[PDB]
Symmetry: D2
Subunit: 334 residues, 4 copies
Amino acid sequence: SMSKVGINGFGRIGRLVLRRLLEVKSNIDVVAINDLTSPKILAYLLKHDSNYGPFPWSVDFTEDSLIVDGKSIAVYAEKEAKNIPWKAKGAEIIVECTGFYTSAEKSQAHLDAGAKKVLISAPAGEMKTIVYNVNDDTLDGNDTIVSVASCTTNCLAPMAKALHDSFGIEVGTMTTIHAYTGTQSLVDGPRGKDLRASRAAAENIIPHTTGAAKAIGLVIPELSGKLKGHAQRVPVKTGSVTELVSILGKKVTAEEVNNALKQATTNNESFGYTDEEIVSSDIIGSHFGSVFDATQTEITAVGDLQLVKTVAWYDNEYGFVTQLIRTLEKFAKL
Amino acid sequence: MSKVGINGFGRIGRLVLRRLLEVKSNIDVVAINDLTSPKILAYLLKHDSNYGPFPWSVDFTEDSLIVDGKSIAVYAEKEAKNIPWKAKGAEIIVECTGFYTSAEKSQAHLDAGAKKVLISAPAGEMKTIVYNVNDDTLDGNDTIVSVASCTTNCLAPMAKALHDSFGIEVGTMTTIHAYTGTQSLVDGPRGKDLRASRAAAENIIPHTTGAAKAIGLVIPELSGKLKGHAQRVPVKTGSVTELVSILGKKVTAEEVNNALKQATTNNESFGYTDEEIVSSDIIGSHFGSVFDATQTEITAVGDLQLVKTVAWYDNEYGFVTQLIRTLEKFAKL
Amino acid sequence: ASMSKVGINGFGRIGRLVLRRLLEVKSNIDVVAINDLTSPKILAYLLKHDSNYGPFPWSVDFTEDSLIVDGKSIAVYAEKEAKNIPWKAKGAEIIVECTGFYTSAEKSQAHLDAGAKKVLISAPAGEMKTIVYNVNDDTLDGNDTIVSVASCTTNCLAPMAKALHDSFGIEVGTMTTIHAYTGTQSLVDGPRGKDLRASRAAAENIIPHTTGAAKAIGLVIPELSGKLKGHAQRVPVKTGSVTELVSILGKKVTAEEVNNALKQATTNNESFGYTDEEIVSSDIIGSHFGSVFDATQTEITAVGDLQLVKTVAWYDNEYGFVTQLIRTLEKFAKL
Amino acid sequence: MSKVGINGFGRIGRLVLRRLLEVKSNIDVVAINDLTSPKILAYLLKHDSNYGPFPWSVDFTEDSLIVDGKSIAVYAEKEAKNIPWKAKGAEIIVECTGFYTSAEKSQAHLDAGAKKVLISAPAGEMKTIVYNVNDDTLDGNDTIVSVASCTTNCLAPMAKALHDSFGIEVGTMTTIHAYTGTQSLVDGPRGKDLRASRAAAENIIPHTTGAAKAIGLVIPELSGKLKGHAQRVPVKTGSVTELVSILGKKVTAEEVNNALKQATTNNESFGYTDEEIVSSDIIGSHFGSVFDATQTEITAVGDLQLVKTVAWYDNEYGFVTQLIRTLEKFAKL
Ligand SMILES: NC(=O)c1ccc[n+]([C@@H]2O[C@H](COP(=O)([O-])OP(=O)(O)OC[C@H]3O[C@@H](n4cnc5c(N)ncnc54)[C@H](O)[C@@H]3O)[C@@H](O)[C@H]2O)c1
Ligand SMILES: NC(=O)c1ccc[n+]([C@@H]2O[C@H](COP(=O)([O-])OP(=O)(O)OC[C@H]3O[C@@H](n4cnc5c(N)ncnc54)[C@H](O)[C@@H]3O)[C@@H](O)[C@H]2O)c1
Ligand SMILES: NC(=O)c1ccc[n+]([C@@H]2O[C@H](COP(=O)([O-])OP(=O)(O)OC[C@H]3O[C@@H](n4cnc5c(N)ncnc54)[C@H](O)[C@@H]3O)[C@@H](O)[C@H]2O)c1
Ligand SMILES: NC(=O)c1ccc[n+]([C@@H]2O[C@H](COP(=O)([O-])OP(=O)(O)OC[C@H]3O[C@@H](n4cnc5c(N)ncnc54)[C@H](O)[C@@H]3O)[C@@H](O)[C@H]2O)c1
């Protein structure tokens, strides 16, 4: 049940994709990587990680490859995906991690370069969009290009699904307090057209737009147009948290909300539970897409009116990557 | 009244003096009580990690600070009752230690010779003032009053404007808030509070606040209608409060923003921006709260509507401007 | 039939990491008691959740008077004064003194009054027997009762200094360590005893800081006694630090010759590592060495006969130092 | 020459304009070249994460900024040779991009119709000026010159003082330096430089710098006598330079301190402190360097002696004060 994989964009997500596949001893063989740099620099960045520490396997490079745990992985440096020589090592499924091919029409260039399927590590417009253990049963053997949405969608979606299923969500808004990422800036300076993105990320609370709630109907069709939200980007290197304020279809207590969620996390490798008073560094390295936090649940009620606040943590790097890999393994088998 | 003692010469305490002198007030700080030496209080007054060098000359002797040429006595009584407020003639005590946060406790200050107490924190069930929301509840008989928390001074003007314009029926707040001294630098015990034990500059840390819970003291019609909490994050000062409300009227973002723009007009306490600011831009603000029209969001499904409004606050210096606005008035009664 | 029962006094950053490392290495040493100033509940929470190293790798539960760690019960006491700790209840023999409040022989001998047999102090503690493992642990003997492992900084500096002095001679030197902030500092600007600089917000400043690592190096390397001075610059990283030594040596060297001597001193040495990779401080986090010499930073400045040599070593001032503490403890326990 | 253009409207570029306005310079900034829209440049000028709100008005058009009411043309030419400096008559270009740090490269601004270039960084073997150390060497016929680095502006006045008083025979420097835009926010490729590829706000990152090696361009008698390097650390601005020297005379610390105190007297570029300051206290400094008497250390064994001296610098605003001093003189020759 092998399938050969190529990684396009060996960055925070792309490097963690290899990390995780070796960690779970996946049957997937990673045979090629495409980025914009030398094998040398990619070896350095794979070996040493500011968030997750030394790579658990050996790493070397040659003039045109990485040698990871004694296995050779070709390195290419093609700016445009249609020029990547994917057939040279039979890379059949591309894990598209650059941020620059987030649509069907743009990821087509990997199929034109000779791959069979593309799994995109970000929202990619109206395409099949999977949160593993929420809607992965919609994957079938005709799918060629799919998205796993954002970290934030993988955090939000299981909480939202559980609340919808148990109580119905009539309307809600989300705020995620999110670690800073590579889309931001180190010192104040231009960052494309987003003004807030131009600002020094480790020195500010920065409001930030995200489509996690807005496009939740790709993942949970029943909640199409029922959710909005945004992010506040904050100075932590990884580890994030998602609050959702909802009007539910039934009146509830906090205990009742927590039981329902506990039930949804039972035998669920994607969605965990805590009643410990954890903080974001405690989620770093999580193997869940989302961890519901029963300690932060809140019911505000006056007469026939009730607001329900529910909160879940996520490691927007490694946690999300575990979800991406669950999805890759199923997408490779169909 | 024109003479002030400060108890607790901390982040708040020191900025009080700074603000008074900034506005050339005719209130004079004549005495300070804390736990340390005038050497160390001078060092900290002069050198501030958040606001840079003090704008006036500072010096010290063994029992005093010398600030812009004027002498301020320094005491170090553990217990407020021992403070000789009488010596230098201190009429009003700005209480900033965090340790006398009630009517009974701040009484010690009157016992030690001062007429009135303004507490820099929530302080139970007393007159609790957000200037430019409910400062006209203050009368000449009042002796001991609160200015609530930073978060209170952020939330109350926003809630006031929305409630007057539209009605708030119910809401929940989250403030994404700068770490403060009640937290820990490294992981280790901080009384009984598990989350306050964790390294503050390396974590997003959920935290209890009763700014929403106790909003009734400031806006009596909203009693029991709001709840909320904080997420404490690694910025040294500058914070932001989000309120999700159910309003008594359907609204657009543009309507919400114009009602707020209007409430902020010629309003010393409560400002407005439609610029794409971030937390560092609020550092040194002269408002208690700055409504950010860029973050307004209306989520509507039929007859159901969630309204998210967002306002920034310098939880240090912004809040202090309010404390000093209230102090200026309280000293005239 | 060697000493096998430990008590930890001060279950803090160092104290909790002592237990962690003992379990990691499958030590035959059993931690039977902990003394701190708090409830089992809070110590359990802190042990389970660590901002720097992540989730405890073993099970953690607690009762009203104990912790249960990997299924093994550990008594918890809360005695502010060491002389009242009831060490004899579970038979604690060696105390790992990690509070910071008992940094002398006079102070720490209170644990002996309290029923323990020996004390190992996780910090410099005046002129008592002071051990950097794999530098001068051969000086430790059966009669040693109270001993120090000096600081994180001493455990970083000493093996570099030892190699250099052995190979070339150190005539004189000055150290600066760029060091993670620690609990002795302040979160926000406010009083912190009488040290002015320690009053300043640690995660928002570069803060000069006095350390005796160099001053007191003679305790560990007798021939360098009074030959070194130094200080620290505390900076906003949570853990991971680096020590620079600038020396006048007794011989003209090249950078290559200094690197090869250092390489050789780090061979078959579990305490002292070597690197020639372009690493940064987060890469030293969780290191099992007390010191890692970095050949990339070596620098020889020479004008005629005047020569200055700068050598640089990383250290994880929490975990890496803890590994050294544990190496010394294991030895201590069997003398 | 009164008319200036800025290439690279970055941290240095923007603070150049801010400082010129602050000292009410007679220099007229007429044009700015960068890579982006006047809208984005306006936003960045208005709101500064390190120094707060811009003290003057800022607006924009599709091709200009309006700053304090004055129009500044905005161009977006990634090759300096195509920047149309002749349009508004920009004569002196303040070259702040990092991409033209050599005579051969900056020559392009002259080809593009300017008369002089002042580079905000080391630029090899050309006239390199640390103001109040070697500005006397600036010559009427110089058309391309350097102000070296931040670090060079810190080190040079301290080295000069020590060398003139005691003779510096050999020495080595380490600067513990705030992170800059040459580093990375998250771990990722940053050219060929491996350490620049690492998350700057989460690491101590050793970094090469020529400030010591190139010192001869500023203090010729010290050519080849110094070496050094930096450690980049998680502060947003404000840095400190340590120098360890063998001097030509035995000294005490008071002696070194006194000598340095004397060098700083009446010196707009080179300050002195004997207060226990930390890095945030240097932010917004108007000196190129502030010598710190509190950190001086003399280590002596027999006849050998090592002297450690230490100076703070605001690598952004402090350095820029030097750039401006140099610019004002350069404009008048
Ligand atoms: N928190 C997170 O970081 C996170 C979470 C979920 C999803 N994502 C998404 O995953 C994707 C990558 O995020 P990241 O944080 O890893 O970003 P990143 O900047 O760390 O990595 C991107 C990598 O792609 C390379 N690259 C850029 N353009 C390229 C091109 N044309 N061809 C080949 N390589 C190219 C870069 O050199 C870099 O190595 C983005 O879509 C992002 O939205 C990120
Ligand atoms: N920092 C904020 O964001 C903020 C905002 C609004 C309100 N407040 C409130 O203002 C008060 C002070 O907060 P802070 O951040 O200034 O705290 P802080 O810890 O900075 O300062 C407290 C000062 O009081 C001193 N102190 C402690 N116990 C004392 C006693 N018994 N007698 C005299 N001095 C004593 C300390 O030495 C210190 O200088 C608190 O009640 C807090 O809730 C803080
Ligand atoms: N980088 C480091 O953190 C480092 C490295 C080397 C050595 N050290 C040394 O190790 C010791 C501990 O450092 P730490 O960083 O773990 O400090 P910490 O403040 O994290 O831990 C101190 C612990 O001891 C407790 N404590 C304080 N006084 C007490 C008493 N009288 N009785 C019982 N418990 C008490 C505290 O509650 C806390 O749990 C200090 O001597 C320090 O110098 C620290
Ligand atoms: N601490 C410091 O930041 C510091 C101190 C002293 C000297 N310097 C030096 O000054 C120079 C600028 O540093 P900075 O920190 O301002 O950098 P920065 O990256 O903040 O600014 C660079 C600016 O130049 C622009 N730019 C890039 N390439 C360009 C091009 N080809 N044409 C036009 N504009 C371009 C960018 O968009 C940006 O606005 C560098 O040479 C640096 O070494 C920096």
